[PDB]
Amino acid sequence: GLYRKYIEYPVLQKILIGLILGAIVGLILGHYGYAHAVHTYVKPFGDLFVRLLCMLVMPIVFASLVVGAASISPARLGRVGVKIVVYYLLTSAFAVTLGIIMARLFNPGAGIHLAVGGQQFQPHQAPPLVHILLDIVPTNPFGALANGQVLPTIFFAIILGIAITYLMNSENEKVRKSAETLLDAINGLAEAMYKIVNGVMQYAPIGVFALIAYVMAEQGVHVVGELAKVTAAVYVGLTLQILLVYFVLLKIYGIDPISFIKHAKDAMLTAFVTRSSSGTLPVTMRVAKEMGISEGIYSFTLPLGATINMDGTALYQGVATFFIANALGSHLTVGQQLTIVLTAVLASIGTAGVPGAGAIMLCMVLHSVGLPLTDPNVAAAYAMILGIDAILDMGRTMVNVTGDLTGTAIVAKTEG
Amino acid sequence: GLYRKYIEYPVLQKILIGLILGAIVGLILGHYGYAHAVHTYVKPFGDLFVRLLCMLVMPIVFASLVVGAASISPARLGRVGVKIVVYYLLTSAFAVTLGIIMARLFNPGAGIHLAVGGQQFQPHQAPPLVHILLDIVPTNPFGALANGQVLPTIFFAIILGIAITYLMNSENEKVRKSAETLLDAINGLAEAMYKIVNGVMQYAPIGVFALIAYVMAEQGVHVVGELAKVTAAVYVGLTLQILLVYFVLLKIYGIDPISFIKHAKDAMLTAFVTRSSSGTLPVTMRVAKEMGISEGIYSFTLPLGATINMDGTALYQGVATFFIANALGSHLTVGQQLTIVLTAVLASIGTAGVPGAGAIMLCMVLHSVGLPLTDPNVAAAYAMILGIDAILDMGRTMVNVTGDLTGTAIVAKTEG
Amino acid sequence: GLYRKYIEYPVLQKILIGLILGAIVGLILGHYGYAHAVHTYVKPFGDLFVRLLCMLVMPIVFASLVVGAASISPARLGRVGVKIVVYYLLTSAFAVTLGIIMARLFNPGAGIHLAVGGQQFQPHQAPPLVHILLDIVPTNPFGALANGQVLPTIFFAIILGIAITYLMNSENEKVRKSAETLLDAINGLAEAMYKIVNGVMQYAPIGVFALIAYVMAEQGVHVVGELAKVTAAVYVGLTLQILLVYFVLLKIYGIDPISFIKHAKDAMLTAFVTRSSSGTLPVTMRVAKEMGISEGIYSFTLPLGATINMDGTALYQGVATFFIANALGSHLTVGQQLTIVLTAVLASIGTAGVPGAGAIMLCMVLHSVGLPLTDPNVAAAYAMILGIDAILDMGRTMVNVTGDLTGTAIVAKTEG
Ligand SMILES: N[C@H](C(=O)O)[C@H](OCc1ccccc1)C(=O)O
Ligand SMILES: N[C@H](C(=O)O)[C@H](OCc1ccccc1)C(=O)O
Ligand SMILES: N[C@H](C(=O)O)[C@H](OCc1ccccc1)C(=O)O
């Protein structure tokens, strides 16, 4: 039973084994001058992995933001809801700004030049500011859904979800059942896409093996230092995010951070091992139960925080969208970084935590900046940043779960 | 509480105030030579209003015509249903023909030449008649839904709704629950789009202010006379529609029109004040109760007439699609006017009455004629016709409610 | 009552009458040199028929394969399910291979050259093998759904259906109701498309009359011999399919074929007369009851076999996609025939049997080979193969029902 041996084996150790064997086989076949053979016989598996993730980008955008804007809408929110939603959004924006800062303080992907076709990627000239601020609103929702265009789909999905929740509180019965049926169908589409991404991340060791094999064979030993710089920038940014943001917010609101980080050890460690937010929700509820938090103020925010409070994933956005920019020669302008901040805050507003979906949110961010996955240079830089996704997901899920308990404790010790 | 002051204030007086202040500020800044400044600092708000309405065009088309063809279908209709549906369609066609006649008898938008880019809008050459009569049927329903193409979406939506009602009367159970689930999801999409257009028409005073400010600053005082000609043509056409059509039909069918128009005073006046058809449905039912109409012959037609019997909105189509044509230098050919008649009859077959959706049906009509909102001349002429939408909606809702009671009385006094 | 006379008249005799009168009127108007008049005054009706079928292609693909992959998925299958699903797929593949063989052994559509615009259809050059094997997976599911692209829609629909069934077996309640709501909405879309194709095949006599009239007037008497060669190739292939495949499989598994083909006479004959698979399901259940088949092993496979076991329809695919290739001068390469095998196996995985849907599966096959219905030569060859669809559907439904009882008997006499 080779198939039942392969699936029952755990995912994280499998991707780590595929990554290590991919680096070894890629460097060995790159020393022997076998780069074109390993290219034409190995690289299509990683291309299939990249194409499966790019397939799963857009329905996750539409359905997840409809459901999440249906879970965040001002039609059904109290004081605790607004009080923690403004905290979650204002923390995600400062986390992606810290990701920009930590990508500027290091140099992820410098030195290497990824002109794979013989020409560098030249960025198309930016429109005026009012043209992009008007082109956020789509002319056609099916049109903006039918070819790329992450930001108009984001706007239309948020507006449609807020309208669905305003529809579910009317005196009529037929429109209430109709809005409930539409919201349940879109929620089923979102959860079906999450089951497909669970299957794709089950396939993911072979794709990581192929991508890292081709990358180590073509670029050489010179790329593992820049990947180590990427890992160092991400983990230093996450540690400084935890320290600065959560510790200063807890000391302003009067909660001692050492006892908090002692009590949150289980909720951090099971998110480090099992790289999921929805899978660590009973452990997070147990940690919030053993802290002194009231029942109706932790039994509402933690299922909301497992959906709308990706704090480390936005820092990974801010580091990775600058690594992919610096690994192509170009650089992002001021006015293209606020697009990263907007499309890293509004993307993590409905996505439930499944392992390996930051690789989908990365294409969501890149498709709105001007670095699309159709050009051959971004498809190589995204491969280089996708090959080390498993050693970053364990980092960017722990702070994603830590921010939930931080916001729950801050909202708890300002009302009672 | 500036926001709760702004929303709780009524909509119609707000749009009238924004229109008057927009005309005043536009003429004053046009006398001082400040046209480029008011352009680049004011016109994007009206562009955002136009882009929100153009966003809301196409899902209203698909979902509203699926629901309305599900409410008009020959699978579930008696004698009264066919007897009033053929009346409603044959009255809407003659109303849009009277709109064409009243646009020809006046001259809406003559004299002005809207070459904003330095070139006039040249119409693309028409295909043969059998090419457009075959291109009514789409090759791809998702394809015709994904880029414009109002008439193929209209055809596919009507066919899908008739198929849904033929599906809901079968002996099986699974396909009955499946058709009910699909129809309820599409109905929820339609009502969600109507809640979005209620929000957009709540935003609408700032957009009307910006559009009329830019229009009075660029074109000058010479455009308010043509807008007055448009209002005069619309209201003369609506008054002659009421008089000729309803009075001669009531005198042929033997009902005295003076006592009818005395009894229908509440249903006319509350539709003039509150510019809605669904909002005046209990008042219309009360007026039909105080007329001598049988219970099962007024308790069926008035919720149907509030959906499929827009008689004044089609006259506004027939006047406005000729105003936008005459304000660009071109003229509509015979064979392009039957497209206006078809896309003004089939558009008002599922749309429930919400205030300010004639501006969406106008883009529905214009996108099928050859005057799309992407070219810069039609986006200015549509702005000029959109800035005075509030002083036309009160006119074109009163006859829209009057035709309901007229058809109810005609169908009542031919059976009992 | 001309309309109620026309609809209540049976469909098959109506299409046969339209075919015979179309051939007669086409040959008579072709002898008098009246080809351009019968073209410009008759051919648009057949073009409307072709456009209605091309409209109904793509939603049947998406919805039918979502439902059929939801009915074939490995999440809910026993030993009997896998045992008969691998039989059905391995029989459909050998049936379409026998269709390729029977199209090679005859010469369907040779001699005639269909350069209607003055130029022959030149095939676009094929990409490498790994490019098409990677382009099976879409980059955008709404994108691949929005312009043609049958194979990416097929892949995404099968993956989404398997994910829906894996979603309907979880411990949560909200995601179970959500997956059930999404699957029921897609099933309602599929059954609505089947009701539309029932209406289009009700219209079909006028379209068959127009297509055969234009074909006999333009090409002449020389095309009825090649159409007779097509009918002979299809029926010889179906008879050899029955004989070889079913008789050798029944003699290997130890069931006497003469008593089987004596008992299956009702289920063959009512499928020959009423050309449907879902309409002959009680007769097929009655035949399996009068054979010696256990209750839980014939009450599961025959509603599955009426959906996923089109054996003669795949042979009609294999003959017709080579007739349309040979009637244009070009020829299909090895590597374009495995596309026919794949898109003739995976297409008949969710489609319930309705009369005249092989004309839709033919466009499904042709749109993935490189013979699209937009070029004017394939739109004439598809007309020539569509005009004789009624005298082929009776053949390709009988073996479609016979394979159900064959697989049921084979699966029955290997377990008990
Ligand atoms: N690890 C994070 C989590 O599960 O919470 C992260 O969350 C998924 C996610 C977060 C934001 C946007 C899309 C998808 C991931 O797994 O990539
Ligand atoms: N005033 C009319 C009404 O509400 O009945 C009119 O009706 C909305 C309508 C009518 C026809 C097509 C689309 C939308 C409008 O408000 O613009
Ligand atoms: N005659 C066959 C049947 O009904 O079983 C055949 O089945 C329909 C079908 C079969 C395969 C793919 C699509 C549609 C047809 O009618 O064309």
Key features of this structure:
416 residues; Proton glutamate symport protein; homotrimer; mainly alpha; binds (3S)-3-(benzyloxy)-L-aspartic acid
Explain what the structure shows.
It is classed as transport protein. The structure is a homotrimer of 416-residue chains. With 416 residues, chain A is mostly helical. Chain A has a single domain (2-413), classed as Sodium:dicarboxylate symporter (Proton glutamate symport protein), CATH 1.10.3860. Chain A has 20 helices and no strands. In chain A, helix 2 packs parallel to helix 9, helix 4 runs parallel beside helix 8 (150-167) and helix 9 (174-218) packs across helix 19. The longest helix of chain A has 45 residues, at 174-218. Chain A is globular, with a radius of gyration of 22 Å. Chains in contact: A-B, A-C, B-C. The A-B interface holds A 130, 133-134, 137-143, 145-146, 156, 159-160, 163-164, 166-167, 174-175, 177-183, 185 and B 44, 47-48, 51-52, 54-55, 58-59, 142, 145-148, 181, 184-185, 187-189, 191-193, 195-196, 199, 373-374. The structure holds (3S)-3-(benzyloxy)-L-aspartic acid (3 copies).
